[PDB]
Amino acid sequence: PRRRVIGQRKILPDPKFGSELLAKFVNILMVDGKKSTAESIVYSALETLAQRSGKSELEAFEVALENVRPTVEVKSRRVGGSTYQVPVEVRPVRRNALAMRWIVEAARKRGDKSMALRLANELSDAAENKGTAVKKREDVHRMAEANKAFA
Amino acid sequence: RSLKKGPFIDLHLLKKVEKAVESGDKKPLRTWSRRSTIFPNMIGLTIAVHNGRQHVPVFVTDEMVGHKLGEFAPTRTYR
Amino acid sequence: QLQYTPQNRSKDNGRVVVEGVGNLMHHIARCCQPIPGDEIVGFITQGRGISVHRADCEQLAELRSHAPERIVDAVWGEGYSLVVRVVANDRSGLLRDITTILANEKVNVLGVASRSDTKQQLATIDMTIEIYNLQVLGRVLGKLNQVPDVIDARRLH
Amino acid sequence: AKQSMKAREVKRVALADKYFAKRAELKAIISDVNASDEDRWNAVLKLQTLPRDSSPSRQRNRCRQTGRPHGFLRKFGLSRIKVREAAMRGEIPGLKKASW
Amino acid sequence: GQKVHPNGIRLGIVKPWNSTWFANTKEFADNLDSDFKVRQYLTKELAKASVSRIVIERPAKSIRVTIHTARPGIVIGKKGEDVEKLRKVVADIAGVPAQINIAEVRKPELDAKLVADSITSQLERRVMFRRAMKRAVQNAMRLGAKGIKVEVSGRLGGAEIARTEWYREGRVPLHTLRADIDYNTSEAHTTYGVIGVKVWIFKGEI
RNA sequence: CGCGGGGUGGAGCAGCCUGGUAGCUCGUCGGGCUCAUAACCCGAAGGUCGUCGGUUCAAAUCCGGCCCCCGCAACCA
RNA sequence: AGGAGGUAAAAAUGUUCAAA
RNA sequence: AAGAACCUUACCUGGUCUUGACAUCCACGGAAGUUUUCAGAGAUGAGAAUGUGCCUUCGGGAACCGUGAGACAGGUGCUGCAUGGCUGUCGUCAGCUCGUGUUGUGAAAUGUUGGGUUAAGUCCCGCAACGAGCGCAACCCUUAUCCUUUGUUGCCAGCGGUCCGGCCGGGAACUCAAAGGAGACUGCCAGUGAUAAACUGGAGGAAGGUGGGGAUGACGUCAAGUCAUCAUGGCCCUUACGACCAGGGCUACACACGUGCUACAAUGGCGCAUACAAAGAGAAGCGACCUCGCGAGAGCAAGCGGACCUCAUAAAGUGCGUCGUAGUCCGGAUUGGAGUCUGCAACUCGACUCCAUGAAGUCGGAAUCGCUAGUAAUCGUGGAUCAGAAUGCCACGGUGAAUAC
């Protein structure tokens, strides 16, 4: 934060197929620490996706994922008090991180039923990238190019 | 809501009540036993129950019986 | 502008001692404004404790027409607030006559009640006060009767 | 805390031992499911005959020294402030500033 | 408001407790209470005895009482008879076999409680405080104290607005746990009012 | 006396001219920011429509008398 | 080292006397 | 305030006390004490009985009780701006001084500044400064690995019997237990840097750089807080502001705020089955089992003052099923009835159980707080206090993140 260097803590790979990326994805969707249940959702939801599209678990995932990955984003520069939003390329880590985050977010709404299904459908919409999550991505890209006058 | 091992009362009050009953509807009793539960024989009596700065008389109407005397002497005055 | 101390003494106990018992939730009536006159007669009320509804009064007798067991005697031992109807033969600033005598009088006068023109041209002021020595009552009343326009000036029950 | 109060305390104990514990049988076996008769009644009645105090419920457990009626760590029998005063002084055996 | 009572933190690691007896919660508090009694009582009795510290022990039913102090003479009394006097009264204080025993402390100037009594008693004698303070420090320091720090709190000098003044020479490492310290307190009772005294003494590092 | 205007939340003003449903601004009340008040921000209560009577299904509103205030006129005399 | 360029809108107030 | 029904209790109301509720002193009388009755809210008032005891001032008793008088007694009565004691706090921030010398007439500066470096006036270098002290760190406790010693009430691998319970022989290896110890030091290497301190990366390692936690809080600031822990100068009352008793009030309720618990559900509730803890407490106390009860509990009642026995089968979790987004099986408030226990006493004013009821609330305006690791969040356990009485506090472990550009 200040001077302190970060210790990019290691994340254990997912048990059913060592996808450390998905592992952290669970960690995002996870709530109150009941990781087992979180993992239960992520799985059944992932299967339902694989079932659905016809694509296998994770491969369908990143395909559904990249289609929401922000490339840039606003940031608040100022000069003594003159605050104004600034576009800036996102870190790849922070990139897919924000991707999963927004995905879980749009998943928070869209009251179909169980999270597994609601999430499944969100990623499914990402498969053709027209779901609510991508609405966030576009919005941020507008927040970029409709402000791309800073560097 | 409690003490189902003989409804609770007071020797001085009880005896004062019996003494009154067998003596007829005499002068109102002036007990401080707000703890005292009412008993059947009490009906008709006008026992006064101190409640801080009075004795607020209460006729022992039929209804009340299991009720403790305090419930008939409001203590905190308001408006 | 000058409108409980007189009843803060009853709230300080004493006065009424029904059948020889002290410190009771007594409280003076209204239709009858008992003072240590024809003694008084008590009446137990559900809430409010004992009601000192004066000795010999209709509403008291009504209660004598219902639950006699509730009825009880009354005493005094060691009197406040009353109302005296004092009808005037119309005023027009003649309330001043009433307003005049108030000085040497030492009782506080709470609510200055009145009325007049409804029918025969003649006012009918009534007055709440706070009596002390019962003698002082008699000491004052005549002065009220004295004023010529004051045809009526006796205690109202 | 008021010599009077400390005194009141002592008296409470005195009676708690001059009566109850040795006369608490009324409150005890005679207020049980056996002597259903008026006996049981008179018992829970002779109870009030006794002094209001004496009943251990009224014992306020004040600080042995000061008299303060609160923070009385039964274990030491002292009011928190005082149990500390002795503590830091080492007057209490094996009692040191916990730390882990 | 800040500083932890030195002796407290230095208990287990360096300085042994004034008491040394075991007891279950059963007869615990009682033993402690009696301890308090023998403490304050015996203190009053030996108010003039320049008493240092009075260790209390309970070796099974027994109730030993070591009394570190200056002048064993006035302590024990002639023929040591005054001891058995305190014996009788003390055992009557704990309803048990009080085994009193005394070890004279060699140098009073170094011991804290003894210094505090000096100071306090002197303020009680209406001597200016500053003189007594510098006096104690000179004495204790030259005598061999590796370091010392004395403080006087309160009205002092009859001033109408209480304040605090202090002194200290050489190393007096209070945070250094291993470092020994002899902290103690006493207080004057001048007609003006209570005037407290604290006094630290770094005698040795280990 | 004559002609016209007005009287509406605590205050100043719309709404009346074309009847049913009275709004804005400050002020007031509660919360927020602040070390604390102001400002600022969030939420809120408030007006028997001068008084009396009438027409109407309904009157703040259409009609009249009355009380008050302002404006105009009060000339040849 | 020699240098020029860009670079920070608004934001009031605090009753009087008083510690060796 | 670690725990207001009485008590506590300081406040109110009324009934009462006066050398007193409590202490030292002296005179006189009476052992102390114990039993039961009447009045009264009780205090106490009147007693009616009964008992007369361990050294002899052997005309005593030491005692304890009663009475008398004067000193006193007593105050939770004001003053924390008269105080001690003690605590919060800026702040675990890294600062704060002094001796001497020196510069300046002097208030003062220098040291402590400066280049680097650190979590740090930490350390190195330079410097009219040389040194020293309070601090910083270290020393301390806990945890993280291993070794040694000991083997019950703990442990079970190796063999045996096994009524499969470490249950019994028996085993000391192991988990563990509690002491005595090993280990971490920028010690090793690379590089950056002034061959300085140190810093960056790697090695070995349980542990890597102050490993994580805690305890420890400088000179002082606030004339902060407390005279109600206590102690104390003052001043104040002293047939009373002191003392006892009953009931009462501290729990009042148009309203405002702070701090928390329980929710608004589907990462869920509910029904059934089933998995893995730690840390504690305990005797006028924890209290199995067994029995009746829907239960709260009640009867009987072992073991236990404790690695034994009890509190006390953990819950989140997992398996299975149902409900299927409704104010809905969400929510549990509120309310009626019937009950339990503690306790003289549950009305004001207790905790808990059952049946019944079943509201607001459908993620909260402006604004605002906590949190960087096994933390937050979520989950249940226990303890102090305490007769009973927590969603508070104190402590315990389970599950276990996000992000630091």
UniProtKB/Swiss-Prot annotation, chain B:
InterPro entries: Ribosomal_uS19 (IPR002222), Ribosomal_uS19_bac-type (IPR005732), Ribosomal_uS19_CS (IPR020934), Ribosomal_uS19_SF (IPR023575)
Superkingdom of origin organism: Bacteria
GO biological process, one term: cytoplasmic translation
TM helices/strands, residue ranges: none
Keyword Manganese: no
Molecular functions per Gene Ontology: rRNA binding; structural constituent of ribosome; tRNA binding
Keywords in alphabetical order: Ribonucleoprotein, Ribosomal protein, RNA-binding, rRNA-binding, tRNA-binding
Oxidoreductase found in the keyword field: no
A cellular component term, taken from the record's GO annotations: cytosolic small ribosomal subunit
Family listed: Belongs to the universal ribosomal protein uS19 family.
Subunit structure: Part of the 30S ribosomal subunit. Binds S13 and L5 and cross-links to the A site tRNA.
Protein role: In the E.coli 70S ribosome in the initiation state it has been modeled to contact the 23S rRNA of the 50S subunit forming part of bridge B1a; this bridge is broken in the model with bound EF-G. The 23S rRNA contact site in bridge B1a is modeled to differ in different ribosomal states, contacting alternately S13 or S19. In the 3.5 angstroms resolved ribosome structures the contacts between L5, S13 and S19 bridge B1b are different, confirming the dynamic nature of this interaction. Bridge B1a is not visible in the crystallized ribosomes due to 23S rRNA disorder. Protein S19 forms a complex with S13 that binds strongly to the 16S ribosomal RNA. Contacts the A site tRNA.
UniProt cross-references to PANTHER family, sorted A to Z: RIBOSOMAL PROTEIN S19P FAMILY MEMBER, SMALL RIBOSOMAL SUBUNIT PROTEIN US19M
Swiss-Prot record, chain C:
Organism for this UniProt entry: Escherichia coli (strain K12)
Leader peptide range in chain numbering: none
Location of the ACT domain: 83-157
Covered residues, full protein: 579 to 742 of 744
Disruption phenotype: A slight increase in biofilm formation in a csrA-disrupted background; when combined with a spoT disruption (a ppGpp0 mutant) there is a very large increase in biofilm formation. The ppGpp0 mutant makes decreased levels of CsrA and its inhibitory small RNAs (sRNA) CsrB and CsrC. Deletion of relA alone decreases persister cell formation in a hipA7 mutant; the double relA/spoT deletion obviates persister cell formation.
Family: Belongs to the RelA/SpoT family.
Protein function: In eubacteria ppGpp (guanosine 3'-diphosphate 5'-diphosphate) is a mediator of the stringent response which coordinates a variety of cellular activities in response to changes in nutritional abundance. This enzyme catalyzes the formation of pppGpp which is then hydrolyzed to form ppGpp. The second messengers ppGpp and c-di-GMP together control biofilm formation in response to translational stress; ppGpp represses biofilm formation while c-di-GMP induces it.
Protein's UniProt name: GTP pyrophosphokinase
From Swiss-Prot, chain D:
Keyword Ribosomal protein: yes
SUPFAM superfamilies: Glucocorticoid receptor-like (DNA-binding domain) (SSF57716)
A biological process term (GO) from this entry: ribosomal small subunit assembly
Family from the record: Belongs to the universal ribosomal protein uS14 family.
Listed name of the protein: Small ribosomal subunit protein uS14
Keywords attached to this entry: Ribonucleoprotein, Ribosomal protein
GO molecular function, one term: rRNA binding
Transmembrane segments: none
GO cellular component: a single term: cytosolic small ribosomal subunit
Pfam families according to UniProt: Ribosomal_S14
HAMAP family assigned to the protein according to its UniProt record, in alphabetical order: Ribosomal_uS14_1
Functional summary from the UniProt entry: Binds 16S rRNA, required for the assembly of 30S particles and may also be responsible for determining the conformation of the 16S rRNA at the A site.
Subunit structure: Part of the 30S ribosomal subunit. Contacts proteins S3 and S10.
Swiss-Prot record, chain E:
Presence of the UniProt keyword DNA-binding in the record: no
Pfam families: KH_2, Ribosomal_S3_C
GO CC terms, sorted: cytoplasm; cytosol; cytosolic small ribosomal subunit
Cross-referenced Gene3D superfamilies: 3.30.300.20, Ribosomal protein S3, C-terminal domain
GO biological processes: cytoplasmic translation; ribosomal small subunit assembly
Domain of life: Bacteria
GO MF terms held by the record: mRNA binding; rRNA binding; structural constituent of ribosome
Family as reported in the entry's similarity comment: Belongs to the universal ribosomal protein uS3 family.
Subunit details: Part of the 30S ribosomal subunit. Forms a tight complex with proteins uS10 and uS14. With proteins uS4 and uS5 encircles the mRNA as it enters the ribosome, which may play a role in mRNA helicase processivity. Some nascent polypeptide chains are able to cross-link to this protein in situ. In collided ribosomes contacts ribosome rescue factor SmrB.
Entry protein name: Small ribosomal subunit protein uS3
Organism: Escherichia coli (strain K12)
Gene, per the UniProt record: rpsC
